[PDB]
Structure formats: C-alpha cells, structure tokens
Amino acid sequence: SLWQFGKMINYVMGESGVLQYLSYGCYCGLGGQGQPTDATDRCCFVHDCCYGKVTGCNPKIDSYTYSKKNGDVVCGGDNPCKKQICECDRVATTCFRDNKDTYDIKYWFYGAKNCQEKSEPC
Amino acid sequence: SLWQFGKMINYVMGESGVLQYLSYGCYCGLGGQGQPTDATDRCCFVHDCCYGKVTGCNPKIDSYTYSKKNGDVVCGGDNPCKKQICECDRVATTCFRDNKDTYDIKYWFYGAKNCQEKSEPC
Ligand SMILES: [Ca+2]
Ligand SMILES: [Ca+2]
C-alpha cells in the first residue's frame, strides 16, 4: 500500500523522505502526466507503469509483506500479487537513493500545471 | 515552508496526515490543475491561491514562526510576509479538519491525468 511505500521511503531515504519524494516532478506520486523532469522523476514514472502492471490486487490500497533491516528493504510473503506491489515500491526507493545526487528542489511540489504536455507512454 | 506545513498537518490531523493530504484530488499539493473534486480539495485550491498572493518571500521554501499546543496551531513572529505564509498553511489545516467527514480515498493520490480539464482561476 502507499502507506507502506511511505514507510519504505522513510526507512531508506530518511524522515524527510516522504515529503521530499511524494510530490516531485511530473510523476512522483501517481497518475502523473507529461514528460519526466529528471532521473528521480523517471523513478516515479517507472513506478507508475509498475503499478499499471499489477492485476489481481490493488497497488494503492492492499498491504504487502516486507522487512526493513540495516538500511534496506526486502519484499517477502507468498502472495505473488502483493509481492509484485512491494517490488514496485522497493525498486522505486532504491532508484531514489541511486539518483539523490541530481535531486533538485526546483521539482519539489512542482505544479501539475508545469507538466501539461504530451505524456510519455508506458 | 512546506516542511512546516507537513508538521502542522501532522499535529492537527495525526501522523497519517501528511500522506493522506499532500496528494489528494486535483489541488492538494501545489500547482494543481482542473476542477476541485470536493470540499477537501477546495481547501488546497484556496491554499494554492493563498501562496499565489505571497509577495516578498517564498511560501514553499521560507521558514515561518508557529506554535503547536493542545491540538491547534497559532502563527506568530513579526515578519508579516512569513506570517502570511503561515496563515495559508494554518487555514488549510483547519479546513482539512472541518471537512474530514467527506474525505474520500477515491481522491487519494488521484492522478494529474484525472484533472485534465480547464482550471478554475484564482
Ligand atoms: Ca505518476
Ligand atoms: Ca494545487
């Protein structure tokens, strides 16, 4: 679930992570539009597309199984649909960490109105 | 600052508040587009317009002065521009509380792509 995504982001990126990442660029969040602004935003683009591939369960709402130890996240459980959701979230957090060095506060709480151009398709 | 907005939301609405409110509807966040979905979303519409009225300081970035005691927020300090920012945030949190009974998870992390219609002007 998005609540668990926020917990993951917190764990991996720090306390300020949820605010820092879940309104960024054109895609960070869900259901974005337009062109990804930078590498971090492409993390959320891929995340969106990832949730788009989940059939059989709800990636926004349903709770998966995960562990957090010594700084990173591992997805578990024996319900493959929920683990697919978890993997979307896990991948996205590692992608945020990998690209932290190009994070630009210009794109923090970037308006929707700044992303009104043709959307890149999944 | 938006960091302080998140602290306020936390304080007033509870721990789950930041995730619950800062991607909701068409406006919750900043720089939204389209038509407000419901009363909560109109809270953020008004918030956006409120930040639009701040001249002389930066409502996203600059730190204001506030206190949190026994459940609500009061804006202080003697820099009127920063207090204007604080008031935008304070008003918005009280508006979220006032409308909690029509909060609908349909609009949680509602895509931008669901708000692609003519925008209501400030
Ligand atoms: Ca998105
Ligand atoms: Ca907005």
Short mmCIF file of C-alpha atoms and ligand atoms in Angstrom, two decimals:
data_model
loop_
_atom_site.label_atom_id
_atom_site.label_comp_id
_atom_site.label_asym_id
_atom_site.label_seq_id
_atom_site.Cartn_x
_atom_site.Cartn_y
_atom_site.Cartn_z
CA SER A 1 0.00 0.00 0.00
CA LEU A 2 1.01 3.73 -0.42
CA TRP A 3 1.18 3.91 3.37
CA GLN A 4 3.89 1.18 3.22
CA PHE A 5 5.58 2.97 0.33
CA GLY A 6 5.88 5.99 2.61
CA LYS A 7 7.29 3.81 5.39
CA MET A 8 9.84 2.39 2.95
CA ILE A 9 10.85 5.82 1.67
CA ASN A 10 11.23 6.94 5.30
CA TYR A 11 13.43 3.95 6.10
CA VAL A 12 15.63 4.16 3.07
CA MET A 13 15.82 7.91 2.48
CA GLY A 14 15.30 9.33 5.99
CA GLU A 15 12.47 11.03 7.93
CA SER A 16 12.23 13.86 5.39
CA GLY A 17 11.82 11.38 2.56
CA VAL A 18 8.02 11.22 2.33
CA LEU A 19 7.66 14.94 1.92
CA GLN A 20 10.71 15.14 -0.34
CA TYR A 21 9.57 12.47 -2.79
CA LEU A 22 5.88 12.13 -2.95
CA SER A 23 5.25 15.40 -4.76
CA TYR A 24 8.23 15.79 -7.09
CA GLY A 25 8.45 16.42 -10.83
CA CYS A 26 5.66 15.24 -13.11
CA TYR A 27 5.32 11.62 -11.83
CA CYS A 28 6.28 11.36 -8.14
CA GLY A 29 3.04 10.26 -6.70
CA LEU A 30 0.66 8.56 -9.02
CA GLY A 31 -1.28 9.15 -12.11
CA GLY A 32 1.17 11.80 -13.34
CA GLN A 33 1.22 13.42 -16.78
CA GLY A 34 3.72 14.84 -19.27
CA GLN A 35 7.48 14.26 -19.50
CA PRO A 36 9.67 13.08 -16.59
CA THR A 37 11.81 16.05 -15.48
CA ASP A 38 14.92 14.21 -14.42
CA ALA A 39 16.24 10.84 -13.21
CA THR A 40 14.41 10.96 -9.92
CA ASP A 41 11.12 11.71 -11.71
CA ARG A 42 11.81 8.81 -14.09
CA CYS A 43 11.95 6.61 -10.94
CA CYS A 44 8.33 7.53 -10.29
CA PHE A 45 7.41 7.25 -13.96
CA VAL A 46 8.64 3.63 -13.89
CA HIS A 47 6.81 3.22 -10.54
CA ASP A 48 3.53 4.33 -12.09
CA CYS A 49 3.96 1.95 -15.01
CA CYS A 50 4.85 -0.75 -12.48
CA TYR A 51 1.56 -0.26 -10.61
CA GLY A 52 -0.12 -0.33 -14.06
CA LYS A 53 1.12 -3.87 -14.47
CA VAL A 54 -0.49 -5.16 -11.26
CA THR A 55 -3.58 -7.30 -11.97
CA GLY A 56 -5.43 -9.20 -9.33
CA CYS A 57 -4.78 -6.82 -6.46
CA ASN A 58 -4.76 -3.06 -5.74
CA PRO A 59 -1.29 -1.46 -5.55
CA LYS A 60 -2.53 1.71 -3.88
CA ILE A 61 -4.61 0.07 -1.13
CA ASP A 62 -3.53 -3.54 -0.46
CA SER A 63 -0.94 -4.42 2.22
CA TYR A 64 2.07 -6.44 1.38
CA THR A 65 4.83 -8.12 3.39
CA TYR A 66 8.22 -6.54 3.83
CA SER A 67 11.16 -6.30 6.15
CA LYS A 68 13.45 -3.34 6.93
CA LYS A 69 16.86 -4.22 8.45
CA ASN A 70 20.21 -2.37 8.40
CA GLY A 71 19.04 0.23 5.88
CA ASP A 72 17.35 -1.67 3.16
CA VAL A 73 14.13 -3.30 2.21
CA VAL A 74 13.39 -6.84 1.14
CA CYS A 75 9.94 -7.98 -0.13
CA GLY A 76 8.54 -11.23 1.16
CA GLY A 77 5.29 -13.11 1.58
CA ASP A 78 3.80 -15.90 -0.54
CA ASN A 79 1.06 -13.86 -2.27
CA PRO A 80 2.73 -13.04 -5.55
CA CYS A 81 0.42 -10.16 -6.41
CA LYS A 82 1.14 -8.36 -3.19
CA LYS A 83 4.86 -9.07 -3.58
CA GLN A 84 4.65 -7.53 -7.11
CA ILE A 85 3.29 -4.36 -5.48
CA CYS A 86 6.05 -4.44 -2.88
CA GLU A 87 8.65 -4.81 -5.63
CA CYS A 88 7.33 -1.71 -7.41
CA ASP A 89 7.83 0.28 -4.22
CA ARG A 90 11.19 -1.27 -3.30
CA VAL A 91 12.62 -0.64 -6.78
CA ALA A 92 11.41 2.92 -6.68
CA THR A 93 13.03 3.66 -3.31
CA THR A 94 16.43 2.21 -4.47
CA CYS A 95 16.09 4.35 -7.60
CA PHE A 96 15.58 7.49 -5.44
CA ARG A 97 18.73 6.61 -3.44
CA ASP A 98 20.72 5.97 -6.65
CA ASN A 99 19.81 9.40 -8.05
CA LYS A 100 19.93 11.51 -4.90
CA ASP A 101 22.82 13.47 -6.33
CA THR A 102 20.65 15.05 -9.03
CA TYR A 103 17.60 15.77 -6.81
CA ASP A 104 16.68 19.43 -7.44
CA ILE A 105 14.31 21.33 -5.23
CA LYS A 106 13.03 23.13 -8.40
CA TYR A 107 10.87 19.96 -8.91
CA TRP A 108 9.67 19.64 -5.27
CA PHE A 109 5.92 20.23 -5.33
CA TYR A 110 6.28 21.15 -8.98
CA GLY A 111 2.81 22.01 -10.15
CA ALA A 112 0.71 19.72 -12.41
CA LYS A 113 0.39 22.93 -14.45
CA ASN A 114 4.14 22.60 -15.25
CA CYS A 115 3.65 19.13 -16.72
CA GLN A 116 0.86 19.87 -19.21
CA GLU A 117 2.46 18.37 -22.26
CA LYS A 118 2.00 15.11 -24.10
CA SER A 119 2.53 12.20 -21.79
CA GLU A 120 5.20 9.60 -22.28
CA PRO A 121 3.50 6.20 -22.61
CA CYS A 122 4.29 3.13 -20.56
CA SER B 1 7.82 26.26 4.44
CA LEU B 2 6.19 23.02 3.04
CA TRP B 3 8.20 21.12 5.63
CA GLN B 4 6.36 23.16 8.33
CA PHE B 5 3.06 22.64 6.52
CA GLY B 6 3.66 18.90 6.87
CA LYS B 7 4.46 19.34 10.56
CA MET B 8 1.23 21.30 11.01
CA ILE B 9 -0.85 18.71 9.16
CA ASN B 10 0.76 16.02 11.34
CA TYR B 11 -0.08 17.93 14.51
CA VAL B 12 -3.62 18.78 13.62
CA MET B 13 -4.70 15.74 11.61
CA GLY B 14 -2.48 12.97 13.06
CA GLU B 15 0.64 11.04 11.97
CA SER B 16 -1.06 9.75 8.82
CA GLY B 17 -1.98 13.28 7.79
CA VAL B 18 0.97 14.11 5.53
CA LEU B 19 0.44 11.10 3.35
CA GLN B 20 -3.33 11.47 3.47
CA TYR B 21 -3.41 15.11 2.36
CA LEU B 22 -0.48 16.05 0.29
CA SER B 23 -1.53 14.11 -2.79
CA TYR B 24 -5.32 14.37 -2.84
CA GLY B 25 -7.74 15.47 -5.55
CA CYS B 26 -6.64 17.99 -8.16
CA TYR B 27 -5.07 20.63 -5.84
CA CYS B 28 -3.67 19.03 -2.65
CA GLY B 29 -0.06 19.84 -3.04
CA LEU B 30 0.78 22.76 -5.21
CA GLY B 31 0.46 23.95 -8.70
CA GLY B 32 -2.62 21.80 -9.34
CA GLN B 33 -4.89 21.94 -12.39
CA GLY B 34 -8.55 21.44 -13.28
CA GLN B 35 -11.62 21.47 -11.02
CA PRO B 36 -11.52 20.84 -7.24
CA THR B 37 -13.06 17.40 -6.61
CA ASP B 38 -14.67 18.04 -3.26
CA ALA B 39 -14.50 20.25 -0.15
CA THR B 40 -11.16 18.93 0.99
CA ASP B 41 -9.66 19.59 -2.46
CA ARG B 42 -11.14 23.11 -2.37
CA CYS B 43 -9.10 23.58 0.86
CA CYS B 44 -5.96 23.05 -1.20
CA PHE B 45 -7.29 25.10 -4.10
CA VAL B 46 -7.67 28.05 -1.70
CA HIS B 47 -4.21 27.18 -0.29
CA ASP B 48 -2.64 27.42 -3.72
CA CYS B 49 -4.29 30.76 -4.38
CA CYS B 50 -3.13 31.84 -0.92
CA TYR B 51 0.51 31.07 -1.76
CA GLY B 52 -0.11 32.97 -5.04
CA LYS B 53 -0.79 36.06 -3.00
CA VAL B 54 2.54 35.99 -1.15
CA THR B 55 4.95 38.66 -2.44
CA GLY B 56 8.25 39.42 -0.84
CA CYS B 57 9.01 35.93 0.40
CA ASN B 58 8.82 32.29 -0.81
CA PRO B 59 5.90 30.27 0.58
CA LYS B 60 7.35 26.92 -0.44
CA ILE B 61 10.86 27.43 0.99
CA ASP B 62 10.95 30.13 3.70
CA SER B 63 10.54 29.27 7.42
CA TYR B 64 7.95 30.95 9.50
CA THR B 65 7.15 31.09 13.21
CA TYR B 66 4.44 28.97 14.75
CA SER B 67 3.37 27.25 17.91
CA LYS B 68 1.52 23.95 18.40
CA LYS B 69 -0.22 23.49 21.79
CA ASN B 70 -3.22 21.37 22.84
CA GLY B 71 -4.14 20.42 19.28
CA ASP B 72 -4.04 23.59 17.32
CA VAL B 73 -1.75 25.95 15.57
CA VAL B 74 -1.22 29.66 16.02
CA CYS B 75 1.00 31.77 13.69
CA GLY B 76 3.37 34.25 15.25
CA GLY B 77 6.52 36.22 14.52
CA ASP B 78 6.94 39.86 13.49
CA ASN B 79 7.82 39.28 9.81
CA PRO B 80 4.47 39.79 8.17
CA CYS B 81 5.38 38.02 4.95
CA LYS B 82 6.37 34.86 6.73
CA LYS B 83 3.27 35.08 8.93
CA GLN B 84 1.17 35.37 5.70
CA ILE B 85 2.71 32.06 4.58
CA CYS B 86 2.00 30.52 7.98
CA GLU B 87 -1.62 31.69 7.77
CA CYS B 88 -2.06 29.99 4.39
CA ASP B 89 -0.93 26.72 5.94
CA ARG B 90 -2.87 27.14 9.21
CA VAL B 91 -6.12 27.94 7.37
CA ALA B 92 -5.64 24.96 5.12
CA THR B 93 -5.12 22.53 8.01
CA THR B 94 -8.29 23.80 9.84
CA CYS B 95 -10.15 23.40 6.54
CA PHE B 96 -8.99 19.75 6.28
CA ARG B 97 -10.23 19.11 9.85
CA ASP B 98 -13.57 20.83 9.10
CA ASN B 99 -14.19 18.59 6.07
CA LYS B 100 -12.80 15.29 7.32
CA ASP B 101 -16.25 13.78 7.11
CA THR B 102 -16.31 13.96 3.31
CA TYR B 103 -12.69 12.79 2.74
CA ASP B 104 -12.88 10.02 0.12
CA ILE B 105 -10.00 7.71 -0.60
CA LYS B 106 -11.08 7.77 -4.32
CA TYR B 107 -9.14 11.12 -4.46
CA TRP B 108 -6.03 9.94 -2.53
CA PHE B 109 -3.14 10.03 -4.99
CA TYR B 110 -5.68 10.82 -7.69
CA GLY B 111 -3.69 11.15 -10.87
CA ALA B 112 -2.95 14.51 -12.57
CA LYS B 113 -4.36 12.68 -15.60
CA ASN B 114 -7.79 12.74 -13.84
CA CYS B 115 -7.70 16.53 -13.54
CA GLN B 116 -7.00 17.45 -17.18
CA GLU B 117 -9.81 19.90 -17.65
CA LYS B 118 -9.99 23.67 -17.68
CA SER B 119 -8.63 25.09 -14.48
CA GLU B 120 -10.66 27.18 -12.09
CA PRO B 121 -8.95 30.58 -11.75
CA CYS B 122 -7.93 32.21 -8.50
CA CA C 1 2.87 9.38 -11.56
CA CA C 2 -2.59 22.85 -6.05
#
